[PDB]
Amino acid sequence: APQIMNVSARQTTSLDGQWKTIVDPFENGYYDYRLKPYDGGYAQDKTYSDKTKLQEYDFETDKLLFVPGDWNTQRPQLYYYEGTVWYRKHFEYSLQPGKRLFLNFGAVNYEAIVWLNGKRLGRHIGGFTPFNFEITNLLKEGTNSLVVKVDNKRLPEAVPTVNADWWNFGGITRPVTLIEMPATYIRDYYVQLAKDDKNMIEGWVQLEGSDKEQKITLDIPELKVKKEVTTDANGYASFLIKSKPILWTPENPKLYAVNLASETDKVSDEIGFRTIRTEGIKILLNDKEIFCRGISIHEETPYYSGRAYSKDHAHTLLSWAKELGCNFVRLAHYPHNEEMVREAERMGFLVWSEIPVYWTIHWENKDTYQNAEQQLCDMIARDKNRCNIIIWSIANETPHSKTRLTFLSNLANKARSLDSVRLIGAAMEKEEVQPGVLTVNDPLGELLDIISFNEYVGWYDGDSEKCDRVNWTFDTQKPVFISELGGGALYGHHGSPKERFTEEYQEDLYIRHVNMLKRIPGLAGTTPWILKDFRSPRRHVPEIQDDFNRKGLVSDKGQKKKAFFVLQKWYKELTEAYK
Amino acid sequence: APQIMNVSARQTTSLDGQWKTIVDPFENGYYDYRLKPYDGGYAQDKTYSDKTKLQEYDFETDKLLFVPGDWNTQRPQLYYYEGTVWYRKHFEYSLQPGKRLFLNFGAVNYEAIVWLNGKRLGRHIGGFTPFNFEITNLLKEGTNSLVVKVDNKRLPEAVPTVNADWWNFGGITRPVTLIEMPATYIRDYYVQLAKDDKNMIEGWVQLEGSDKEQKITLDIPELKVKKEVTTDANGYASFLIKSKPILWTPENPKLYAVNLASETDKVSDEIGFRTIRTEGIKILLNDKEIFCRGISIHEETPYYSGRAYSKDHAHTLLSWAKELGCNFVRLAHYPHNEEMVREAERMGFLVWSEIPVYWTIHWENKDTYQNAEQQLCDMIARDKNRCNIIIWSIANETPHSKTRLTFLSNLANKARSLDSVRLIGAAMEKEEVQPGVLTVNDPLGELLDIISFNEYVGWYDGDSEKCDRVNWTFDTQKPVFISELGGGALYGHHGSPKERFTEEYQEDLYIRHVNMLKRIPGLAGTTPWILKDFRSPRRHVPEIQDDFNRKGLVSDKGQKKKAFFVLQKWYKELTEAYK
Amino acid sequence: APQIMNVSARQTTSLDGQWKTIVDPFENGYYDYRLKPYDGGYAQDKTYSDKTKLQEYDFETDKLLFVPGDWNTQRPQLYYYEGTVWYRKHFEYSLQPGKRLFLNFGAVNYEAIVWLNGKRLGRHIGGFTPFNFEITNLLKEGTNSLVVKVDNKRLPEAVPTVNADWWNFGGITRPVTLIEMPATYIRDYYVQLAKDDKNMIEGWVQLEGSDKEQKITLDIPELKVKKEVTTDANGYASFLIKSKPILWTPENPKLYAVNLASETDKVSDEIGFRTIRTEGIKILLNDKEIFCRGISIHEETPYYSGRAYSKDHAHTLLSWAKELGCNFVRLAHYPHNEEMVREAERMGFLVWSEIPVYWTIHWENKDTYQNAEQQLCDMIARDKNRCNIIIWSIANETPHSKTRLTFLSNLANKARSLDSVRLIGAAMEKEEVQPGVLTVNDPLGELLDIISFNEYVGWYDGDSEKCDRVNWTFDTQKPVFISELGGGALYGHHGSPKERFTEEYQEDLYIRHVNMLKRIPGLAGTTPWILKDFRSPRRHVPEIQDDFNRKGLVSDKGQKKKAFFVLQKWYKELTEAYK
Ligand SMILES: O=C(O)[C@H]1O[C@@H](Sc2ccccc2)[C@H](O)[C@@H](O)[C@@H]1O
Ligand SMILES: O=C(O)[C@H]1O[C@@H](Sc2ccccc2)[C@H](O)[C@@H](O)[C@@H]1O
Ligand SMILES: O=C(O)[C@H]1O[C@@H](Sc2ccccc2)[C@H](O)[C@@H](O)[C@@H]1O
Ligand SMILES: [Cl-]
Ligand SMILES: [Cl-]
Ligand SMILES: [Cl-]
């Protein structure tokens, strides 16, 4: 039930493919007509072969869905579906006694309830973070039954809440994986550079199980590093190691093979090393001033616009970012699958990672807060060894209020106590200093290392020309990072640059908007909205949006719009400028 | 806004056909990202003709839906849809000044918000009762814009609530009508026999408008009747008319042409006359003891299984009930469309009419009660001149509790305060006196004219054999009425009479269940469940249910299953024994 | 109307995006009720703006389809659809006086008929080869109307004919492009090594237009080559160039920038250089013995399984082939899009390219032969400069008749007269020498450089064990190339190695099939069937096939089956052996 670091390097067996499914809008499979739980609900996975008895379902003769994936793009009937779908899987597994077996979900949106062989394993909320169950003692010989009740109903108190600008993709959206472990295993570990110290590798390791005190060995063959330690009685041990590793950067994404070994377990990883700091309005990677030439990206696939989960999906999206000239990607509005981060790390993209605290969250709900902080904790726990990640962001656009402020401040501080290296960000509130002159105004900026905010001058705030008459001033000399900007266009739809939603309008906007960005003092990062057209239920212009937010520089069908090349040209100037 | 009696008889213009529509699952057209209402939402019906300005919708180029109709059967994507769909109609209408104009919706499930020319007319909850707006002063020349925002999300506090065994059919489910009235018009009237008096016609008439005191004439020509009264300062007048009409019966459903005429309006009707009362365990219609040879019916069409609304739909269903031997039909679980009631009155079926107070209603919620009572009032107000209805039911199966009893007693009193003639029913709690012997035990019965209850012996309570070892007894000596019973079968699926869901099992069930009914002391009525298979989201056996409740005696495709003829044979004998 | 070389390098304007469409199954848009052509059919693209007159259509208010792409996966209703769909596009283009403008279709399946502003430009048959029209003198000012009548009806006499094992993907399956040319332009050109000579570049260039005698330069800067020549009265010139270019291989796919300029035009290109020949049972690339570690690939996308067309599609597919350990890809069963071939060229994959001459072609129909030979000519003319293509194939599996022999012989002779460098292959008739001993017996073999054939021992011919019971011998000392082999499995479906369609069966099948391949004297190449599960209308096992051929080593969802790694291991050993 605790997070497992680097699942892909473990002893894994996939459960993916196609599973039997039951769409259950009124949750008949969970509650009876009194609205109470009942034995004999669908969790029992009872093949309906004796027809002298009465039951109301039969996984064995029902329809399939693919796992992993959203359900919305797999059947017309499921496009808008919000509610419960039951997934069932049968599998066999041979586990020698003493060995341990875990069931890992990369992600399930939004609530998952899980049973093995008719016995409840647990419950998860939050649709974008992994979770594990140990099934060591519940495995049976022969056929095992795995049942997952998945529900994506919008909940006022959820994270996110009843309103948002992206599709409500339900289902088992990321791979489902079995993991075999020795009785005491390497559960967690941290291997990064010490804060601001390019000559000190530091980290720790965490065993799990009963034989908690063991000789650990950390190997980095290419750095001639062989460090030994012994975990204390809590299965914990820390270390410092002197080394001068080649530093990861976007232009040389240097990664090192790291091998961890205990007396009873072992695991390998790819880990690069860098430092990241603020100095006034400057952002410093390995002590050099950099500009973050970024782009924002939803976890949505090329061509057919389902939930992304694979390396193929990551590679195609990033290869567009590459052509766009980015050295940075913002992954909105939630933690993406581990393959996106790994592929960004491999190709040399810095990363902004993020939780879906977004619009009208319930700031007074003690449960809502626990939810969001759990997501924050899990986002950082999974990716803490990914050096291309330099910004953690604890909030998107939010209405201002004292409850909001106290909520986000708790997240910001918690982020800082988990990762004293990377930069903490959040979407800050904007204020008019005097006409034609804008600034930021958020008392949460004291817990942030950057001045991050969204603005849509020229699309939602005025026509394009208004980018020509807006300017920005700041009362603090922290690096300024604009996390969203842009506007919509349908690829192939042409006309006057005054005609909104044409490629021509969007091109004119990006020209003028870039000129406005060139005037902003302290500007050190931008990630326009967005790389690719994506699904939203808030976009209803027929033949133009068709349930798609059209602010992509690339169409959902991979076609580069005219505005793609405006941003591309600017990023070329910027690359030479900071070279 | 007040109800209008006998809408079909007024000066009517149909707004039916195909309307433009927008599916809006997050309610973008009503709320903004702050979750606040905003001017400029879709109610403004603003055609998106000037693309220099930004807008997120356009009715003019969007998709159509049939009106009337559920949306669920019209598009695969809407099959499961729960949430907001916007409808938009354009129309012209010439109103001679002084004349008034009303907008009548037969039904909209579940919440309707209505606008004319960008102005809100009001809001309605309750998906099976009609409602009106006066649009006399809002009509413009040329094109008028009617926008209706329909939402069918299940609400915990709603009536019905978040669980129920029928499809959540959203949309504008019954015809939409323009009614023109004189400045002062006959709004409402009542013309029926006096309680247990086959020689006294009583009634009243109610005007609406300024000319409140008028001479009123009531003409029943075939009876050689003409009473001429005059209305008070409220527009109200009552009357008593000694007459010896031919009384309506199922075998001879006599109806009279009735003509009302004030100084400034007239309106005709077809009304019949009959007496109805209980005498001990007997039900007496026109002083003669009858048995209600009945069958239950959902408001759902033959063959394609959409929401029924037309005279054609009613006729097909009723001619199945005719062939079954019925003299009675129970319309579940809500007020059906008027066409259905009228068709039943004309062919000769007594009717049971009811409201969707069903399972876990929020008994302690005062708005919930107000909703249910409003639905009660609207039900009785519309049909009070329909002589063929003899039972109003205020409740279906509900849990046992004090709040439920208080709630249901208030409805039962209200029903009685609204109609002194018809019988009041409700699904009562049952109890097992001794093994094999059951009874009713429910203090609500004290407020009811019958012992009415649902029982599914042989389907939910045991296999078919258990019907042979269950018997009933009753303390109170009222007529006993079983409003639901039966079990499921797929037409064309055959096997052993032991195999559930074959035709042979359902036949065996009905044969044993009928012998059980024949041992029930005081049995006066049976409306078995059900006439035609119907859509339910709680029926998930593949290839057998497929989201259909299969307890019809007739398939959803009009095929008579074997059990149909069992019940038909008993109903033939009941016709003999009660002649 | 003639072919144009290197379309992507010219001055191009995409017409892609979404077009208006009319599904027209009875070709009402083209015939009247007399089955005769008629004026005012849909080719006239006449907006229905005057409802005083009668017409049966209106593109302006009809539905969209994405272009490029198959229609089948864009709507449920079009999945199986065979027939006509009208595509309509409006566009503007500013063509300076004297310049020429061409409409280029990458491909349309099967029959395309094309109109600009109501005038027929012409017709094309054959679904996988590009075609052009000149619209220089038809372009009008302002709004131009492009109408394409697309029909994919299966025709007995067509190429392919009424039966084949892949989906009938209809539509404008590949990009549509406007190409602007000077009044006299470089239409075609050839630049490659001379046969077997590592030290000699040969080639030619062809002009189109009235200024036919011009000075042409060919520059290859990295080779310090600058050749000037002058064209003759036919616009033709040939050349020879002593040079020692770095030779292209899969391991080092070196490409040279090549620049061509005449007096009025210029075009650049990327072209590699290699020699290829057979020597006995040996295939020699740049005089080195190679094994073709191949995989077959249909032109179908990962994940959603539409018609592939983009570099994104090719890269993902080819990336799987790279992980498999391939140095070679067979593109079946027709010419793929040019993106696929360029990406194989750039990444390092030798290529097999072929035409859809397949199963029961009408060998005696002269129009059928002309069609097949046109497809051959278009295939070779487009890719003659792609050094990575080393094999052209003029036929897949065919029946064993004299007319077939004549038909294919003429194809094989035409291919050789078009290209004397590349190898010519075709799937050859097999025969049983004696029990357990197969061979090839096909007189066509005289005209082919390799002994190429398909065999599915262990899937269609026996169980997996029969691979152990089969051996091969050949009378002729030519390299043996098996173009297809394998069997089906559903990813995630697990069982005994004896149960067909499990991953275990396919894995066992591949172990014993590879061992059979190890015993084949002369084996110089294999391209197993197939890389990725693909759609097929002859694959009907529910839950297993569901209209997919399951013989992929990769699921249609990117998942590597167990058998993938069997082939991967053998290719790893073949790599070391042929080092
Ligand atoms: O509408 C959009 O395109 C985007 O709006 C922003 S919110 C915002 C709007 C105006 C100014 C400042 C912030 C969301 O972050 C994004 O998910 C959504 O897609
Ligand atoms: O499940 C059914 O077939 C029906 O069950 C009854 S409730 C009940 C169940 C068992 C015993 C007593 C009452 C509902 O009135 C009905 O709408 C539904 O269709
Ligand atoms: O059935 C298959 O999987 C494949 O069959 C071959 S034909 C063949 C079958 C048996 C022996 C020799 C040749 C086709 O080339 C291919 O398109 C198709 O998919
Ligand atoms: Cl947009
Ligand atoms: Cl049922
Ligand atoms: Cl297959």
mmCIF file of C-alpha atoms in Angstrom, chain A residues 14-18 20 60-64 66-68 76 89 302-304 309-313 315-316 319-320 490-494 543-544 546 550 556-559, chain C residues 14-18 20 60-64 66-68 76 89 302-304 309-313 315-316 319-320 490-494 543-544 546 550 556-559:
data_model
loop_
_atom_site.group_PDB
_atom_site.id
_atom_site.type_symbol
_atom_site.label_atom_id
_atom_site.label_comp_id
_atom_site.label_asym_id
_atom_site.label_seq_id
_atom_site.Cartn_x
_atom_site.Cartn_y
_atom_site.Cartn_z
ATOM 1 C CA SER A 14 1.616 -6.640 -17.122
ATOM 2 C CA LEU A 15 -2.134 -7.166 -16.707
ATOM 3 C CA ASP A 16 -3.023 -4.900 -19.617
ATOM 4 C CA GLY A 17 -5.063 -5.762 -22.683
ATOM 5 C CA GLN A 18 -8.838 -6.050 -22.824
ATOM 6 C CA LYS A 20 -14.657 -7.441 -19.233
ATOM 7 C CA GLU A 60 -18.332 -13.402 -18.519
ATOM 8 C CA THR A 61 -20.623 -12.442 -21.418
ATOM 9 C CA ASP A 62 -20.326 -8.633 -21.307
ATOM 10 C CA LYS A 63 -18.375 -6.150 -23.429
ATOM 11 C CA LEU A 64 -14.638 -5.406 -23.416
ATOM 12 C CA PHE A 66 -8.996 -1.642 -23.393
ATOM 13 C CA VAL A 67 -6.755 -1.227 -20.350
ATOM 14 C CA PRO A 68 -5.092 1.117 -20.147
ATOM 15 C CA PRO A 76 -19.962 6.461 -28.630
ATOM 16 C CA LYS A 89 -9.702 -9.288 -15.098
ATOM 17 C CA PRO A 302 -1.967 12.712 -31.071
ATOM 18 C CA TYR A 303 -4.578 11.971 -33.756
ATOM 19 C CA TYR A 304 -7.330 10.394 -31.661
ATOM 20 C CA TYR A 309 0.146 6.686 -21.285
ATOM 21 C CA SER A 310 2.885 5.212 -23.498
ATOM 22 C CA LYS A 311 6.417 6.091 -24.530
ATOM 23 C CA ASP A 312 5.151 6.274 -28.136
ATOM 24 C CA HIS A 313 2.669 8.954 -26.974
ATOM 25 C CA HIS A 315 7.827 10.688 -27.912
ATOM 26 C CA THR A 316 5.445 12.091 -30.537
ATOM 27 C CA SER A 319 9.230 15.633 -30.858
ATOM 28 C CA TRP A 320 6.812 18.469 -31.715
ATOM 29 C CA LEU A 490 -8.843 25.492 -36.564
ATOM 30 C CA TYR A 491 -6.073 24.187 -38.813
ATOM 31 C CA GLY A 492 -7.083 24.638 -42.443
ATOM 32 C CA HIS A 493 -9.552 27.466 -41.653
ATOM 33 C CA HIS A 494 -8.256 30.613 -43.346
ATOM 34 C CA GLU A 543 -17.388 22.996 -37.083
ATOM 35 C CA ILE A 544 -14.701 25.054 -35.257
ATOM 36 C CA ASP A 546 -16.556 20.506 -31.801
ATOM 37 C CA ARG A 550 -8.429 25.049 -30.259
ATOM 38 C CA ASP A 556 -5.057 17.424 -32.751
ATOM 39 C CA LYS A 557 -4.175 15.796 -36.119
ATOM 40 C CA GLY A 558 -0.511 16.854 -35.968
ATOM 41 C CA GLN A 559 -0.780 19.787 -38.402
ATOM 42 C CA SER C 14 -1.725 22.296 -47.888
ATOM 43 C CA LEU C 15 -5.481 21.945 -48.474
ATOM 44 C CA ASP C 16 -5.840 19.546 -45.544
ATOM 45 C CA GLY C 17 -8.133 19.902 -42.522
ATOM 46 C CA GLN C 18 -11.865 19.192 -42.557
ATOM 47 C CA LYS C 20 -17.731 19.193 -46.278
ATOM 48 C CA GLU C 60 -22.721 24.188 -46.986
ATOM 49 C CA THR C 61 -24.815 22.645 -44.179
ATOM 50 C CA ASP C 62 -23.628 19.039 -44.373
ATOM 51 C CA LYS C 63 -21.164 17.201 -42.129
ATOM 52 C CA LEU C 64 -17.356 17.323 -42.006
ATOM 53 C CA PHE C 66 -11.060 14.926 -41.747
ATOM 54 C CA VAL C 67 -8.713 15.061 -44.745
ATOM 55 C CA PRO C 68 -6.459 13.167 -45.094
ATOM 56 C CA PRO C 76 -19.688 4.395 -36.838
ATOM 57 C CA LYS C 89 -13.291 22.228 -50.293
ATOM 58 C CA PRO C 302 -0.753 2.684 -34.004
ATOM 59 C CA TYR C 303 -3.475 2.840 -31.351
ATOM 60 C CA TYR C 304 -6.455 3.889 -33.490
ATOM 61 C CA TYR C 309 0.092 9.164 -43.703
ATOM 62 C CA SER C 310 2.303 11.268 -41.446
ATOM 63 C CA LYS C 311 5.873 11.178 -40.251
ATOM 64 C CA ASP C 312 4.512 10.659 -36.709
ATOM 65 C CA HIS C 313 2.893 7.393 -37.837
ATOM 66 C CA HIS C 315 8.273 7.008 -36.793
ATOM 67 C CA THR C 316 6.260 5.086 -34.188
ATOM 68 C CA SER C 319 10.606 2.624 -33.850
ATOM 69 C CA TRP C 320 8.990 -0.726 -33.034
ATOM 70 C CA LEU C 490 -4.397 -11.453 -28.657
ATOM 71 C CA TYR C 491 -2.226 -9.452 -26.280
ATOM 72 C CA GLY C 492 -3.111 -10.150 -22.663
ATOM 73 C CA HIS C 493 -4.768 -13.480 -23.547
ATOM 74 C CA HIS C 494 -2.834 -16.238 -21.801
ATOM 75 C CA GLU C 543 -13.252 -10.896 -28.251
ATOM 76 C CA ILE C 544 -10.222 -12.439 -29.996
ATOM 77 C CA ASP C 546 -13.048 -8.425 -33.601
ATOM 78 C CA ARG C 550 -4.028 -10.704 -34.808
ATOM 79 C CA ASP C 556 -2.706 -2.681 -32.276
ATOM 80 C CA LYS C 557 -2.172 -0.836 -28.939
ATOM 81 C CA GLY C 558 1.645 -0.865 -28.904
ATOM 82 C CA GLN C 559 2.034 -3.906 -26.643
#
